[PDB]
Design a binder for this molecule. Structure first.
Ligand code: HEM
Ligand SMILES: CC(=O)N1CCN(c2ccc(OC[C@@H]3CO[C@@](Cn4ccnc4)(c4ccc(Cl)cc4Cl)O3)cc2)CC1
Length: 397
């Protein structure tokens, strides 16, 4: 233990993981050189995420401009979070998600049908599939944009190191503002003539007198669109990667496609698309007996918690057959901010992997030109994943 910050960056995962392990052991609550605090143990990550009074999700809590963006449900605390969550959950329903299955399968099947035997999984499927699905769910037209989220890439590639930096707020707003404005216009068109698409549902939604204005509906639809440009794109790459490291599971899921949901849960634990979540202390508190001051940022390492042997047995072992006494998925968060889109992600990744197996039996990652381009910061995964099918319906005698 020395007072010289490293943090292996995300790009070297094995080194990140060895660091996390040692911190879990020796420094479970750590303050970095920017005065940002880090929480590494499973039970402590849980404490933090649950306790919204002490640990607020409003980053703008500190900054002199009390600007909580309306309808940014992940950046809003009780009691307003509660009423907001109720309004959106009433538009964004299981039924609404589940009816998507046939379209999810149609799109996935057509995109793969054209891929050849050697392609980029991200450009071919992992990116265009959720973009298409989420737009259609929201009731938007098909978009012209596609470079693996030109704007969503800019977002995750933000000029950032010190999260205390006030500029950062502006750099984010710079990217999102054009997109939020475009959605605000779409919401106003649906307010005029509502359909059954999700934007119409959002605009008509009302729970205990609380309705979304076009500000809030546009903001929240923007978040949803962003979720669809990034999350499945990262998870599905992580799934193929991991299965490529334990390839016996390709054959097992081919024989019993009902094993697929469990593969997805396991990769979620093993490689969470989002390894860290962020909170701000609203008051002097302590974690693990470590005193933390008011008004500072706190990062909760979901990646650490997931590899913490006190939470799981043999935690670095990739094992889909691991029954869990109360399978609750920390990679989708913990508490009242628990992932609203969890069913949709589970559905898209299940259908995706099903369709990969049905056409190809298996894919392997292709490192025959370069090593993978990992995300350097926000998410845990790769920007591209060139793959190779050994088998496919194209092969002839
Ligand atoms: C692999 C896929 C996904 C992962 C790992 C994931 C992860 C997460 C996590 C960790 C949180 C909690 C954030 C916090 O506590 O600060 C969260 C919240 C949220 N996610 Fe996701 N998500 C995924 C897919 C999606 C999708 C597809 C959508 C919507 C289309 C979505 C929408 C949301 C929303 C709206 C919330 C916040 C709910 C609230 O604040 O009450 N997610 N997600
Ligand atoms: C030092 C350093 O690099 N820090 C690392 C960790 N920091 C960080 C960590 C996590 C993070 O994710 C925040 C939030 C939490 O989850 C999401 C990502 N997301 C999207 C759908 N499901 C999850 C999100 C949830 C809900 C909604 Cl409506 C929109 C979004 Cl988008 O971003 C954003 C930034 C960034 C700075």
């Amino acid at each position: 233990l020395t007072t010289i910050d490293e943090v292996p960056g995300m790009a070297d995962e094995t080194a990140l993981l060895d660091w996390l392990g040692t911190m879990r052991e020796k420094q479970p609550v750590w303050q970095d050189r920017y005065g940002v605090w880090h929480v590494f143990r499973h039970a402590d990550v849980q404490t933090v995420l649950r306790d919204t009074a002490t640990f607020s999700s409003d980053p703008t809590r500190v900054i002199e401009g009390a600007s909580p963006t309306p309808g940014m449900i992940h950046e809003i605390d009780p009691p307003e979070h509660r009423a907001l969550r109720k309004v959106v959950s009433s538009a964004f329903t299981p039924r609404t998600i589940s009816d998507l299955e046939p379209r999810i399968r149609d799109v996935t099947r057509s995109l793969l049908a054209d891929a050849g035997e050697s392609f980029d999984l991200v450009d071919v499927l992992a990116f265009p599939l959720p973009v298409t699905i989420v737009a259609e769910l929201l009731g938007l037209p098909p978009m012209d944009h596609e470079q693996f989220g030109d704007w969503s890439g800019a977002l995750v590639d933000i000029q950032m190191d010190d999260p205390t930096d006030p500029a950062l707020a502006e750099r984010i707003a710079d990217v999102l503002n054009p997109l939020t404005a475009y959605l605000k216009a779409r919401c106003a068109e649906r307010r005029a003539d509502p359909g059954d698409d999700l934007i119409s549902r959002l605009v008509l939604a009302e729970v205990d007198g609380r309705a979304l204005d076009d500000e809030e509906a546009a903001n929240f639809s923007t978040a949803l669109l962003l979720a669809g440009h990034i999350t499945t794109t990262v998870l599905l790459g992580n799934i193929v990667r991991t299965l490529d490291e334990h390839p016996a599971h390709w054959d097992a899921a081919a024989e019993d496609p009902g094993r697929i949901p469990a593969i997805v849960e396991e990769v979620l634990r093993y490689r969470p698309p989002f390894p860290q979540m962020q909170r701000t202390t609203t008051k002097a508190t302590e974690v693990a007996g470590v005193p933390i001051p008011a008004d500072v940022m706190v990062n909760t390492w979901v990646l650490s918690a997931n590899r913490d042997s006190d939470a799981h047995d043999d935690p670095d072992r990739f094992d889909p057959s691991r029954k869990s006494g109360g399978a609750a998925q920390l990679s989708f968060g913990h508490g009242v901010h628990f992932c609203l889109g969890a069913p949709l992600a589970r559905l898209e990744n299940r259908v995706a992997l099903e369709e990969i197996i049905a056409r190809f039996g298996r894919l392997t990652v292709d490192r025959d030109d370069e090593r993978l381009r990992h995300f350097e910061q926000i998410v845990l995964g790769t920007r591209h994943l060139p793959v190779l099918a050994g088998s496919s319906p194209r092969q002839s005698a």
